[PDB]
Design a protein around this ligand. Structure first.
Ligand SMILES: [Zn+2]
Length: 38
């Protein structure tokens, strides 16, 4: 990665995952990738 102006990062709680985002609702929309599949 690299440095720059952004918010505080939130992280995925799931085992073997590496995802992070500055938004709480983008994170909830990512938790659906582990709790459901289509
Ligand atoms: Zn994840």
């Amino acid at each position: 990665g690299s440095s720059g102006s952004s918010g505080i990062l939130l992280k995925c709680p799931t085992d073997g995952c590496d995802y992070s985002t500055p938004d709480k609702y983008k994170l909830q929309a990512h938790l659906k990738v582990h709790t459901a599949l289509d």
